[PDB]
Amino acid sequence: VCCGYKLCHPC
């Protein structure tokens, strides 16, 4: 889910 680069937004 919560990777770092902003393909991943809702953590």
mmCIF file of C-alpha atoms in Angstrom, residues 1-9:
data_model
loop_
_atom_site.group_PDB
_atom_site.id
_atom_site.type_symbol
_atom_site.label_atom_id
_atom_site.label_comp_id
_atom_site.label_asym_id
_atom_site.label_seq_id
_atom_site.Cartn_x
_atom_site.Cartn_y
_atom_site.Cartn_z
ATOM 1 C CA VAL A 1 0.000 0.000 0.000
ATOM 2 C CA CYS A 2 2.178 2.921 1.367
ATOM 3 C CA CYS A 3 5.436 2.956 -0.751
ATOM 4 C CA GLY A 4 6.949 6.592 -0.856
ATOM 5 C CA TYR A 5 6.876 7.740 -4.544
ATOM 6 C CA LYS A 6 3.458 9.458 -5.361
ATOM 7 C CA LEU A 7 1.810 6.575 -7.185
ATOM 8 C CA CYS A 8 1.047 5.707 -3.415
ATOM 9 C CA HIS A 9 -1.266 8.431 -1.790
#
